[PDB]
Design a protein around this ligand. Sequence first.
Ligand code: 6NU
Length: 160
Amino acid sequence: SSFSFGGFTFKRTSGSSIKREEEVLTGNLQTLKIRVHEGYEEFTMVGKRATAILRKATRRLVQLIVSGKDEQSIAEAIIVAMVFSQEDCMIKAVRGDLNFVNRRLNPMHQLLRHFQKDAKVLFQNWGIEHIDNVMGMVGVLPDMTPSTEMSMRGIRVSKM
Ligand SMILES: CC1([C@@H](CC(=O)O)Nc2nc(-c3c[nH]c4ncc(F)cc34)ncc2F)CCC1
């Protein structure tokens, strides 16, 4: 049971979820109704220029291991994973002048379209964490600089 989202083919490799229609608040205090997936799941994300392993719980990204052609491809996959995770810090990153969702249309696609234009606020607001040894995997900073000390929460970059 494969599906498509933001240019990526997702395939659930483990777990399951049930859905619940829920109301969430953006950074502009706008209410959006989203279909929340409850449960722990593991996916493969296959795109034309990046691939990834995503592990998520209800509105929480546990870990994302990304591989890709370059910084832009990888960032593109990171944006989709973050939006897909349904995390509240991703929702709270929708803010400021003109940044309102036009509310039958799917709000997940609307959130994606919003962050694809500029993921600067999404990437800042996400948070950063210290990393462990794990080699062949590097941390990535909000501005896409690689680091061996720190990375955005749960985000790891693997070599192609
Ligand atoms: C078109 C999307 C989504 C719409 C929906 O919820 O039915 N479609 C699917 N999501 C998930 C699915 C499974 N687990 C999920 N966790 C979060 C999440 F946003 C979606 C899922 N599984 C299968 C889907 F077809 C919007 C993101 C892809």
